[PDB]
Paper text:
pmcFanzor (Fz) is a eukaryotic programmable ωRNA-guided endonuclease 1,2. Fzs and the prokaryotic CRISPR-Cas12 systems evolved from distinct variants of TnpB, a widespread prokaryotic Obligate Mobile Element-guided Activity (OMEGA) system 1–7.
In the ds2 sample (TS partially modified), a small fraction (2.8% of particles with well-defined structural features from the SpuFz1-ds2 sample) exhibited only an 8-bp heteroduplex. This helix interacts with another α helix (α1) of the RuvC domain. No clear density indicative of DNA binding to the catalytic site was observed. Thus, we classified this state as State I, as it is presumably the initial DNA-binding conformation. To gain additional detail into the formation of this small cleft, we overlaid states I and V and examined the changes in the ωRNA.
Numbering used by the authors: 18 to 345, 355 to 633
The structure:
Amino acid sequence: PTLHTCNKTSFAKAFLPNETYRQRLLDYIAIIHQLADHASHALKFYILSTSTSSFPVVHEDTIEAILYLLNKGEAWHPRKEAKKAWRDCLLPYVQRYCQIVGFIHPNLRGEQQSINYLTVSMMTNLKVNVQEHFMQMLLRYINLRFDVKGQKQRLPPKSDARKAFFTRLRYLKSVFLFDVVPELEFLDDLTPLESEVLEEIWSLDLPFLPNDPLAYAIVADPMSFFPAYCKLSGLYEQYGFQRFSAIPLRRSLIQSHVRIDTIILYQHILCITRRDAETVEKDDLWMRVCNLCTKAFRSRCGMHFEGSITTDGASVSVYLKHPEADKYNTVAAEVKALYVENNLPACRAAENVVVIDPNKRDILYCQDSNGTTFRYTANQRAVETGSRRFAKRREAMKEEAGVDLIESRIPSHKTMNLMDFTRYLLVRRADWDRRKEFYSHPAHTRWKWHSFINRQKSESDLISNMRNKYGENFTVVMGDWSDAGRTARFQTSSKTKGWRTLFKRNRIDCFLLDEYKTSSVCPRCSSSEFVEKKFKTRPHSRPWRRREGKIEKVHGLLGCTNPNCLQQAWTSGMRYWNRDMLSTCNMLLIVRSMLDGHGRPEVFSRS
DNA sequence: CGGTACCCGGGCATA
DNA sequence: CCTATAGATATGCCCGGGTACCG
RNA sequence: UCCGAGCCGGUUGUCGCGCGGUUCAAUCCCUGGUGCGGGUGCUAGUACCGGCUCCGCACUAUCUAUAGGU
Ligand SMILES: [Zn+2]
């Protein structure tokens, strides 16, 4: 549901100036971060080591058992039969992993809450990693085996050869992905490069539903695909393809956010017996360590603190929880539920309408009916957010600390071979002490929190400037990055949710409009037969491409050659235009046509 | 010295 | 540095450590 | 892996213009903003006329982890 919110504040303003409590909390979060990292590494090691017999069906019990083992040793005494069996199976592998890494059991007490939270988080990471990326990686492997990389340089752009190649590509995938039932003659209709693909795909033991497609089966029981997914990465390793993280790893040594609640408070922070804690109200028990009067803890939209924070030693994210909280395909409509054509009744009553074109450099280029232009570029975000300022010093310190030569030697972590994974673990352990000392510096977390502060300030200033230029109330109509080869969820509508969310937070209505044929029409003559693009050339701006002698045609510059737009005095012979200006003018024309009821003009249509 | 039963705090199960 | 998913705690019961009393 | 923004021109609604001119923005410390009252101070003219800075009331801002993309 949508019954929760978060407010992030600084560590100093969160906890009262009690040095003992702060030190206890810092030690606890460091221990929890170490436990989580070692648990992820041990889970991957166990999964790799058991491939010789069978890929285990990892369960929440598995993660909980791994965490409890790393924490205690053989002292864990679960009473549940499933947990007991998982403990018995995992103990040798965890022992070997600890011996290889030299990990010493922290013997932390009261591990129930933290272990449960980390188990839930890791299982969620497995579920999400298996849900979507499984199909995408399978399709990527199928494309790579067919050598589409080379075929793109072998087939004419539109000739019948490319059509036949596309037909074959879908024909093979339908049988491989269980989309269409094959006939017997399909057996002999396979070249060696295709027979190998069929055999490899079938060797993954893809689970499926007899009455539903593979994609629906993935959504229904995504975790059942976790074993096959682990197999898939192995193939990527055999053929040298772009490897993917089959089993997620918490590589970073920078102190990560750790969950703290009332139970953890009275177990490790306040250090009081449960019988004493149970006799005091939750809020009264929290005030002893946290300044509830701070702005971050105030209620919003009927939500209350409810004793949940996540802290990493530099910033604290306080979660506000609604009383109706959970207490621990049709969706395609959302693709077009927000588009302008379905929201015209609301657009007609908007005080002002602003059309925005996104670009990889001009992240926003906004124009209104009055012609007042505005833009928010990637340079402004990079400078104000401090991303480059932090990057040029945090990465530079590696020269002073010499850790750059350490991280580079680390082999790729996505390997699936047990020997290679052991090599990676040993190499990471070799210089683990120096990296741990380096990342313990407050500067890393301080920059991570200052980045959030700067991004929030930049986002607020952007809205302030937009309101100042266009007015207090306005409706945003933005393009969807349409092109001649973008027709899927992965490419068009997924690259705009950030700005839609940003506008929603400020209660600014945002709608999407088709960007197709936006750069075709000249508004001054409403004609596309006399529009020229990419005529002039200049040296490349990027420092490495520029020194290679590469010359690039201007992308954002367009021209109109129709005589009606040309003054006889102009020696250029063409009226110049900016790509963003023309796109905004065309979007304004389309919106005006839609509002009047005439609909999208035929010239901008996909006919 | 040798052998019992209770109160407490910690640990684990569960939705 | 961008985008996407799931989940975003609390109560009850078992047990094992130490302390109390008789022969 | 290198990059600020506003404005006037070369310019005609023109560029990642390594084109010219001019204004502030930034370096460090800071969770941001909105509407309401005072409370030291700093600014231009005889309480007004404001702007920067704090105090206090409610209105609001979804983060963790991983993964993918570069
Ligand atoms: Zn024209």
